[PDB]
Amino acid sequence: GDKICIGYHANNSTTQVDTLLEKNVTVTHSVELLENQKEKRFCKIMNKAPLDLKDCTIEGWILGNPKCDLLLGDQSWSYIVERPNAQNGICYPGVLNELEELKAFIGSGERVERFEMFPKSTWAGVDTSRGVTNACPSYTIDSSFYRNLVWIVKTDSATYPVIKGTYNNTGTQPILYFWGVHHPLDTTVQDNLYGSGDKYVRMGTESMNFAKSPEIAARPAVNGQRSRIDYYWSVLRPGETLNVESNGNLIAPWYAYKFVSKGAVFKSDLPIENCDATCQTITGVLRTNKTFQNVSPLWIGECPKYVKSESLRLATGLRNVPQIAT
């Protein structure tokens, strides 16, 4: 007799999903929600190139190490790429104070504008020309210094007089600047370089105060130096003013950055290439419509949520039970 039957769809699909009740259930249609695939390169984000620090670290770039001259000047970045093996950083041994906080502030940025904050003329009756060192060669000159600092020394006759400088931040933009205090190994170097007696470096703005004096002792040789430098950084707010006063040991600010302020610093070996990305992770570009990714937690741009998940496949179709054909 005549038959009417009620039934459901089947197909050749072998794709499976898991269930709380059951695992490896083959279903007619399904959607994978997670992306496990990436291009292993750095690309432009918002059609803006990343900044490759190359053989320089952040310290090396921003303090102006002489072997980092390729970096010198204005820079605009979607993000910063710091090569892990970069060997040009702090050439003259010492500590860059609040280094992590500086690295975070530079990361918050998108642009820097390099300008001469204190011309060498500012400091009077002291020697501008001399401050150089074998610990900081460029690729051409065996003895050089940071581009953004001046190692001031007493003039050929004694004595090192009080030196003063001021800068007023007329501008819209915050200024990021650096300075140092020289700690000689010896009373001999101290006296040679600077006139006698107690020495100080003092600096101030409306919100900030700084005072330090040299600590004289020999430290283990680093790049041929038993002496040290204490490096410091600060941000001069728009409408703020900076006063610098010293009688000895000042490694002066010379050049500074007008700073324009989410950003990332990626420490990676991956190549920057002539490509665009909308999602960039530390291990590579994601070019996907997926909801979830298992590539990396660290990224820039619009990226899917990171999870440890291998797959996240949602059944949309029903259980696939196609007819066996022999």
Binding site: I4, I6, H9, L20, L21
Partner: protein
């Protein structure tokens, strides 16, 4: 299957029915065929699509890890950042994985129910004018037209009209 139809009392799917999820197979002196039920199929599609989109939308927030360095005097905050980031990662990994297991279970159930409800929609119309073979199939005790098959499918089936023919057949046997 929890509603018992899919891979249940109805043992298999139809590769023949290519235009829907749920459907009717008919045989008559005129011919035989597979036809999907448009309404139940489309409602299931709208619903499942909505489910996927809702899941996608609820999930399109991101927790962002950071590249921040910590000094040798900052072990505790560094570790705090690490436990915090790992913690959110574990929470979200759990949320997605469990939600997928749960929803896959419930989705398969929804398909099973829709099949079951079509089968019952037919059984109540046919009553004793047809005999229930297994596997979700009904054998009419009366000659059933193409027009008659359509009437069963679209809910217009006329039980009285075939009642005498059917009774005569059912118990001539």
């Amino acid at each position: 299957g929890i509603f018992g139809a899919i891979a249940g009392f109805i043992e298999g799917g139809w590769t023949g029915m290519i235009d829907g999820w749920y459907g009717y197979h008919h045989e008559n002196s005129q011919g035989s065929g597979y036809a999907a039920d448009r309404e139940s199929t489309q409602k299931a599609i709208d619903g499942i699509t909505n489910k996927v989109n809702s899941i996608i939308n609820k999930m399109n927030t991101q927790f962002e890890a950071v590249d921040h360095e910590f000094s040798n005097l900052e072990r505790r905050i560094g570790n705090l950042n690490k436990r915090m980031e790992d913690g959110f990662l574990d929470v979200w990994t759990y949320n997605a994985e469990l939600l997928v297991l749960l929803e896959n279970e419930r989705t398969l159930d929804l398909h099973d129910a829709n099949v079951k409800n079509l089968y019952e929609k037919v059984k109540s119309q046919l009553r004793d004018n047809a005999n229930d073979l297994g596997n979700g199939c009904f054998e009419f005790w009366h000659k059933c037209d193409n027009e008659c098959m359509e009437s069963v499918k679209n809910g217009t089936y006329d039980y009285p009209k075939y009642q005498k023919e059917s009774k005569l057949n059912r118990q001539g046997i």
